[PDB]
Each structure stands twice: as structure tokens, then as C-alpha cells.
Amino acid sequence: GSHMDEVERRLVKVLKDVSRSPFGNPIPGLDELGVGNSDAAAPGTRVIDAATSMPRKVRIVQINEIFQVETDQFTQLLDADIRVGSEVEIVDRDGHITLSHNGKDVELLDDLAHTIRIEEL
Template identity: 35%
Template sequence: MSDVSPSVGAALRTIYNLREDRIPVRRARIRDRLGLAGPTVTQTVGRMVDAGLVRLRDEQYLELTEDGDRVAAALVRRHRLTERLLTDVLKVPAALAHHEAVTWSNALATATERAIVDQLDAPYLSPWGNPIPALDELGVCPPDPGPEPASLAQLGPPGATLPVAVRWISEDAQDDEALVAQLVSAGIVPGAQVRVTVTDGGYELRGLSRIDLPTSLAHVVRLDVMAGR
């Protein structure tokens, strides 16, 4: 990974996160999430394609190659382990740790990652519940995560109300300080049990208080539907 520039690294992490969110990866999605100009994204994508990290499908969709997936997973692992170091050891609030980790993790060596793992108790998840990938490269064997969590879009037709447990918060939400503050204030955090009502225009989540999310943000919370639905 030493040959990956910060711009390529950011793009690879973004592609990985989009895939986690089950959102088709296009240049425009990378542009929006990173806040970059279109030509800059086009140049970065061209470098990734030339390096064999990304390939084009149907001339518009991007997908990671085997090498690209390996590098992207390692970058995401660095980021999430850094978040855990900041929150667990240095007691930095999770919302701040996410943004700090973007800078900190860029300079992290593999030996340092192993040292972080040694300091943490079961570092399988980020502070936001996201699975930390490629831990086997550090000699860590995570437990079976169980069934794939659902997105809000999978919870049924308008009018459906379901009890759910929050599994994780998307990095897209973590990047939005106002949104993540709303989620935390409403108690929509990993491990929380909440009720979700599907509405005509989105989703009503009730935890400590109520928050409404539009359909465009259906990917930001991943959930386990509880028994008794």
C-alpha cells in the first residue's frame, strides 16, 4: 500500500464503503462523497484502472479488482482500527474520531496496526459497529458475524412497523456531522433497539426520540429485525 497516493486511497475507501452500502459505484458517487470536481475524479479513476485496482463495467460502473479489493480492505481496516484506538484508548468521542482517523490512518504502518490490536479488546468492529475487514492479515480471527444486516429499504411496504436492533452506521452518515448528531441524539446507535415505520417518503425511526430519514438515506443504518415482528 505504500505506493497508493492519498487521493487513490480515499477513492478506494469510498468504493469499498459504497459497496458496503449496496450502492452501485459510479464516478458521480465518488465525486459527491469526497466533494471533488468531476475531472479530478476522472483522473483518479484512470490511475486506478491503469494500476489494475479498479475495472469498468458497462462503461459506467466501477468495481474493485482482486488487488483493488485487497488494498481497499486494508485501508478500511487501518481507518477503523485507528477509530478504535482513538475512542477506546484516548477516549476521543466517536464522531470526532471518525474524522481524525482519516488523517491518522494514512501514516499507519502494519506493525502499528498489530500494536493497536494488542491494546484493544476484541477489535472486530469500528466504534460505529462497522466490521473491520482483513483482520486475518494481522493474525486476528473474527467471530462469525451472523446473517447480513438489513437496510431500511428492505423493511417492507409503507405502513410496516418493525422492532429492530441497530447493527452499524454507514461511513456516509459518519461523514455528515449534522446527520450523525441527529442519530446519536435520537439513540440510533449500534446495539440500540428501536422501532422503524416505513412511510410513503422514507422511514420514521423511534429510539430515545424520533428521527425521519428520506428514502435517499436508506443505506445509512443497517439493522437486525428482531423476533416478534
């Protein structure tokens, strides 16, 4: 093909990303994805896929839970409090994933936006 690096195309293990504002807007459920997982059907396409099937506005309905929330780094990401039921959008950029929300754009590593509870664009 022609390269075309998708959002989930990048495979990482560590918990780090680029940009200066990695935190912001609700939806970056880092410890939330742990459990969920989609692939087809409208009922949430999962960020991993919600960025190739002609994305427009991924509707956030949920994430997972709060059980896990013991991290100083997540403290800044918790500023949004992930409001399940909101409405956000995602878009690629030079082979990278970033959720664009009214507020600003975020990073959301492949480990973060792996199994979020959103809608199928």
C-alpha cells in the first residue's frame, strides 16, 4: 500500500506519549479500557477503530469504572472526570492518535484508547 499509519497501527508497551498536553477532555480512560473491547457493530467502535471508518464525532457513553485510580500521573488526566455520555471526536496526524475535544487535543496512547466505551463513527 502507501504506508498510511493508523491510530492502532502503532504498537507500544510503556505508558508514555508525545506532545505537551497529554491530559485533557474526558474519555482518556487509561485504567478503564482494561476489560472492554470492540471490533464491529455500531455500539461503540473503540477508538482503536474509531479513526478510520470515516470518523466524524465519536459519542462517549462510558469507559469502565473507577476501581483503578492510584497514579500521580493520572491526577491531571482525572481533571476531566471522564463524563460518560459526552461527545468527542478523533483524528490521525502524521502517524499518531489524538482525541480532539472542544477543550483541546490529547494523546491517548494505544494503551489508553484501546478499549474505550464510545460510539461507532
